[PDB]
Design a protein around this ligand. Structure first.
Ligand code: SF4
Lengths: 85, 49, 139, 490
């Protein structure tokens, strides 16, 4: 029956240390494959990077804003007929 | 230097009251001090916390 | 009186495991093409008794129960297996390997973390200001 | 389903897809089926963006929809299909280890676009491969389609339900036909990769690897052969493999392995007479047939996973008691120590530390209608199903924490990153014009030591986290196959 006045640390030092990982040429191959899948699907039309953009005053520099807006064909035939954009 | 606009005194009414139960995580998030000691009074010069 | 010497007990256990591993070494280097006898190249309790006699560690121990209990503590570890056969009941012991390697679950520091319930973003202890995460990243 | 999986898929759809679409996707997991207008109302998002999110989710065959009471369309998002985006690299690697870059670049675009026609796959594969070569830019369409047929007849890429009112009811048939191509217009036929086949292949690989490093290297060839003849006749739910005999087995063995008949039967009986109990023989005095047990092997795999977790976290001495009480079911507290030669103090410590973390259960045996905690009997027992199900809930929050830690470090050194990358293009275009080593010392000393030392550590940390992610999500796959087999859809 003893009393503690100083509270325990928020990070109590663990019992043992974590385990190192397994590495093979396939492992870094899959790592680079995931790193390129994420970057490419970030640069896909399916990825909506256009929530909405607000512009208060109009400028003359309208030449450096030629963004190509090509949506994928939604294929409404094999799609719910109720939903029509 | 210029002063920033600030509301003078926020006067509002109470619309409605909602009932809910908290989680231990939110309880710790709101809590300030963690009691670990059971001794109420210290056995020193005078009654002191 | 039941003696207990944990150091002596576990060093005896390590020596017995090494001896059975060496028997498995000899069996595997032998490699008689018909391998029924290879898997049957076990070491019964009566031969680990001879090994106990050749150890020369401490003679105040009755062989049968001590060795069979140590092999029991070994099968509890998951390192060797026993099989009994009624001919007279003879117990043979074989050396088995682990089934699958250590999982990738625990290799992340989140598996070793003792504070798992309090872990949450937006407030106190979280993956952002975690000491274990930083200590894992620096190494 | 629970808060952990929802929190994980939220980030998985915020880093893969956009914020607007991931909002509606997560909102579809809290409520099963809801009308379009009610969704657009309670979510707070406008109608056009909601329709965009919905068509994005449908294009990746992530959400389904059905016709209800009057003519209404109820949408439903399944989380189990969403949580399988962490194994795309493993799927592509498994396609590339058997086949070559053909199958890899055929299937890697089938999972990034979901429903896609083969005329588009051949198109894009041919274009990318012609762009990859330098002098000879000739890629045969026939060899690209040959690997496609190899996927089609091995049941790797199947046909999604085609087109046969407020909407059309999509119907599926058993017509997995391959319409004959016309290489230099076939519409209404979309192909998609089949994931359960990949799961079956991974299960066979795990089984053969376990039986390899367990007893022998040769018997794994025999079981992998026994698992190769049943790829066509056996399915996933079926717990017992179709019966096969040894005479048919000796017919199909590898070419570089010459093993005779009676020694093969020797190996088969050694596999039958075995405590692991993977293969079981039902025969006669004359002959018989062998049957591979999948469920009783998955149970052993999950058990081994549990003991490995408790041995890495708690210790080997603790896992020893775990296995001791798993063997002797319902053992009592004072009789566990006469078996396990372990000091009573720290033994009780280990037992209580295990039970306080939900690793063991205690059952009550009272002799009175009153509970009487004093006058009662406690027994210690182990439950495999609940322990596997509770470790599965931990893995997901672990993966979520790893993803949050990986995403956290990028936004403090972000402007530094796109500023050091902006300097890269200043000299990348300059070197084309003419190499100036003075403009090189400009970039040699323009970046300071901590300005270049941050990327060095950030890349390593990102690599470490993304490599731990796969080692963790393989464990959830090994753990979700034992839970679903015992689950019986009544
Ligand atoms: S973020 Fe760190 S402290 Fe929090 S659960 Fe993960 S490993 Fe543990």
């Amino acid at each position: 029956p003893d009393v503690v006045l100083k509270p325990p640390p928020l990070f109590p030092d663990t019992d043992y240390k974590p385990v190192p990982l397994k590495t093979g040429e396939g492992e870094e191959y899959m790592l680079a494959l995931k790193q390129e899948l994420r970057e490419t699907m970030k640069r896909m039309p399916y990825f909506i990077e256009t929530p909405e953009e607000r512009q208060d005053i109009e400028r003359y520099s309208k030449r450096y804003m030629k963004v190509y807006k090509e949506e994928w064909i939604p294929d409404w035939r094999r799609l719910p007929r109720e939903m029509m954009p | 230097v210029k002063e920033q606009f600030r509301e003078t005194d926020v006067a509002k009414k109470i619309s409605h009251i909602c009932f809910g139960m908290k989680s231990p995580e939110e309880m710790r998030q709101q809590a300030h001090i963690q009691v670990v000691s059971k001794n109420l009074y210290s056995q020193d010069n005078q009654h002191a916390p | 009186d039941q003696d207990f010497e944990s150091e002596f007990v576990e060093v005896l256990n390590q020596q017995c495991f090494k001896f059975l591993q060496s028997k498995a070494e000899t069996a595997r280097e032998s490699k008689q093409n018909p391998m029924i006898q290879r898997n049957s190249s076990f070491a019964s309790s009566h031969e680990v008794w001879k090994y106990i006699c050749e150890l020369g560690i401490s003679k105040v121990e009755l062989s049968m129960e001590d060795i069979e209990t140590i092999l029991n503590t070994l099968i509890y570890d998951g390192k060797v297996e026993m099989t009994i056969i009624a001919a007279g009941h003879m117990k043979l012991y074989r050396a088995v390997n682990p089934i699958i390697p250590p999982t990738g679950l625990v290799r992340a520091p989140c598996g070793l973390c003792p504070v798992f319930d309090d872990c949450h973003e937006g407030g106190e202890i979280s993956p952002s200001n975690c000491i274990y995460m930083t200590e894992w990243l620096e190494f | 389903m629970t808060q952990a999986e929802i929190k994980l898929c939220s980030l998985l759809l915020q880093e893969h897809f956009g914020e607007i679409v991931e909002k509606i996707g997560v909102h579809l997991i809290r409520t099963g089926s809801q009308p379009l207008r009610v969704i657009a109302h309670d979510t707070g998002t406008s109608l056009d963006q909601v329709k965009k999110a919905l068509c994005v989710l449908v294009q990746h065959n992530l959400v389904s929809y059905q016709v209800h009471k009057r003519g209404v369309v109820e949408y439903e998002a399944q989380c189990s299909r969403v949580l399988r985006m962490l194994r795309y690299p493993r799927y592509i690697y498994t396609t590339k280890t058997l086949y070559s870059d053909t199958g890899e670049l055929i299937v890697e675009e089938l999972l990034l676009n979901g429903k896609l026609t083969m005329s588009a796959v051949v198109k894009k594969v041919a274009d990318r491969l012609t762009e990859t070569m330098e002098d000879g830019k000739t890629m045969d369409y026939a060899e690209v389609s040959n690997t496609f047929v190899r996927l089609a007849d091995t049941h790797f890429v199947q046909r999604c339900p085609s087109v046969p009112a407020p909407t059309l009811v999509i119907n599926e048939k058993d017509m997995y036909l391959v319409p004959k191509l016309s290489l230099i217009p076939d519409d209404g036929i979309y192909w998609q990769a089949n994931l359960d086949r990949f799961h079956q292949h991974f299960r066979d690989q795990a089984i053969v690897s376990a039986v390899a490093n367990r007893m022998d290297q040769t018997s794994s060839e025999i079981v992998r052969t026994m698992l190769r003849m049943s790829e066509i006749t056996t399915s996933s739910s079926a717990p017992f493999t179709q019966p096969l005999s040894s005479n048919e087995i000796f017919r199909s063995l590898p070419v570089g392995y010459n093993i005779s008949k009676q020694v093969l039967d020797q190996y088969l009986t050694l596999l039958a007479d075995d405590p692991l109990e993977f293969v079981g023989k039902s025969g006669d005095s004359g002959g018989g047939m062998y049957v591979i047990n999948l469920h009783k092997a998955l149970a052993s795999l999950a058990t081994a996973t549990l003991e490995s977790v408790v041995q890495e976290r708690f210790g080997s001495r603790c896992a020893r008691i775990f296995r001791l009480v798993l063997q002797k079911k319902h053992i009592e507290q004072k009789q566990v120590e006469d078996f396990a030669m372990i000091p009573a103090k720290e033994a009780k410590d280990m037992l209580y530390k295990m039970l306080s973390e939900n690793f063991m259960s205690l059952q009550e045996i009272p002799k009175t209608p009153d509970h009487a905690p004093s006058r009662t009997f406690y027994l210690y027992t182990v439950n495999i199903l609940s322990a596997a199900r509770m470790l599965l809930h931990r893995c997901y929050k672990s993966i979520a924490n790893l993803i949050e830690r990986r995403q956290f470090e990028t936004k403090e050194n972000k402007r530094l990153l796109e500023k050091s990358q902006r300097v890269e293009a200043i000299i990348a275009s300059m070197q084309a014009t003419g190499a100036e080593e003075a403009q090189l010392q400009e970039i040699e000393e323009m970046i300071t030591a901590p300005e270049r030392q941050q990327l060095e550590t950030l890349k390593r940390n990102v690599n470490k986290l993304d490599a731990s992610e796969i080692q963790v999500d393989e464990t959830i796959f090994l753990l979700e196959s034992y839970i679903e087999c015992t689950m019986k859809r009544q």
